[PDB]
Amino acid sequence: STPGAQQVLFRTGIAAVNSTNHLRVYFQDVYGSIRESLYEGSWANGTEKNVIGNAKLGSPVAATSKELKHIRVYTLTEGNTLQEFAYDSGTGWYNGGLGGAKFQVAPYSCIAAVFLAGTDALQLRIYAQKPDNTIQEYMWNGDGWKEGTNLGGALPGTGIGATSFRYTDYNGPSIRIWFQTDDLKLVQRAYDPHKGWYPDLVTIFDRAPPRTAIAATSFGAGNSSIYMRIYFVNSDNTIWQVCWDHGKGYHDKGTITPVIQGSEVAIISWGSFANNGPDLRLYFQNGTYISAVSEWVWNRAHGSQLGRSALPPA
């Protein structure tokens, strides 16, 4: 290993955001501190000088952004409430408003977060698991945090993926979230602006490891059209990818890359097929320097490639 690598928690929560190919990746160090590693041309940071906050050891770590102007990072306090580390361009990092609502969740709750697409307003939808094991939406729409829709039961400790997009032939944002049911399927729930929440859960994978990590992204929103990608850790100890392409629907899955048993996963994307895209970046642990975070890359030039062997501070 290396001294940097050793600072990184084994099975740390992982999250990432970006503006095109400007990248931020958050993880937890062995002491519980949440750090940010950074890529602008080259990889950097991720040290103890790069701490944005502290959270319970073993915390889930989620993030979403509007480019790199507005960033938000979600984790649990020791007392198992939802908190929020916020970055605003021209202000720097501070302690978000989420924490004051004291939203109490299961100790094993995971967390997903999205800024709603197609608006310049700041509209956040955060998802986590209550003590009754239901999935619960929390909204921020410019007058304070509140509970949104309850999307009902799931496997205790389930992974949670989420994404927002805006169809161009609609005048509101859509949302998809993914999670695990008691029978260990992975399913999607779905919100659209005319329909509201559809009542149905739609299987995307028949049987996955319990509490397996789930992460999602979307690109190329058009007219009733979208391209989605959901990733999870499978029984073979590799990340699997599951594709939605418009018209085909949920039409393929397969393996992508090897990970350590119980790795978390973060996904980001930019561009679309129209403009020599998309680009995809996946983050996870695969044993590099034992405990380092690693990167997998998809692009048009070279397709499916391992990226940065080990992220800062490794």
Out of 290, 299, 306, 307, the only residue in the binding site for a copy of itself (CB under 8 A) is 290
The window from 7-15, 103-111, 141-149, 234-242 that contacts ligand MFB (CB under 6 A) reads 141-149
* Candidate ranges 137-145, 212-220, 241-249, 282-290; the one touching ligand MFB (CB under 6 A): 137-145
> Quick one: which segment of 2-10, 136-144, 203-211, 231-239 binds ligand MFB (CB under 6 A)?
136-144
Token reading at 281: 């970046």
> Binding to a copy of itself by residue 287, rule CB under 8 A?
yes
Q: Is 36 labelled a binding residue? A: yes
Please answer whether residues 279 and 304 qualify as being in contact, where contact means their C-beta atoms are separated by less than 8 angstroms: no
In this chain, which of 100, 107, 144, 254 binds a copy of itself, going by CB under 8 A? 107
Residue 195 near residue 173 (C-beta atoms within 8 A) = no
Stretch that binds a copy of itself, among 37-45, 53-61, 219-227, 265-273 (CB under 8 A): 53-61
d(CA 284, CA 300) in angstroms, rounded, equals: 22
CA distance linking residue 141 with residue 114, whole number of Å = 12
Alpha-carbon distance of 161 to 186, in angstroms, equals 10
Tell me if 289 sits within 8 A of 282, measured CB to CB.
no
Find which of a copy of itself, ligand MFB, none residue 185 binds, CB within 5 to 8 Å per kind.
none
Buried b (16+ CB within 10 A) or exposed e, 175-194: bbbbbbeeebbbbbbbbbee
Angstrom distance (rounded) from CA 137 to CA 112:
10
Q: How far is the CB of 74 from a copy of itself (least distance, A)?
A: 18
Q: Of 51, 122, 243, 297, which lies in the binding site for ligand MFB, with binding defined by CB under 6 A? A: 297
Residue 227 binding: pick among ligand MFB, a copy of itself, none (C-beta 5-8 Å cut-off by kind): none
User: What 3-state class would DSSP assign to 303?
Assistant: strand
Q: Is 139 an interacting residue with respect to ligand MFB (CB under 6 A)? A: yes
DSSP secondary structure string, 19-47?
ETTEEEEEEEBTTSEEEEEEESSSEEE-S
Q: Is 40 annotated as a binding residue?
A: no
List Cα–Cα distances, 181 to 28, 134, 185, in angstroms: 27, 10, 6
Q: Give yes or no for a contact between 62 and 74, defined as CB atoms under 8 angstroms apart.
A: yes
Q: Which two tokens stand for residue 190?
A: 């779905």
Q: Does the footprint of ligand MFB cover residue 189 (CB under 6 A)?
A: no
Which option in ligand MFB, a copy of itself, none does residue 191 bind, with CB closer than 5 to 8 A by kind?
ligand MFB
What does the per-residue mask of binding to a copy of itself show for 187-216, with x meaning CB under 8 A?
Answer: ----------------------xxx-----
Note whether 176 binds ligand MFB by CB under 6 A: no
Residues that bind a copy of itself (CB under 8 A): 1, 6, 9-11, 30-31, 56-58, 106-108, 133, 155-157, 182, 209-211, 233, 235, 237, 260-262, 287, 290-291
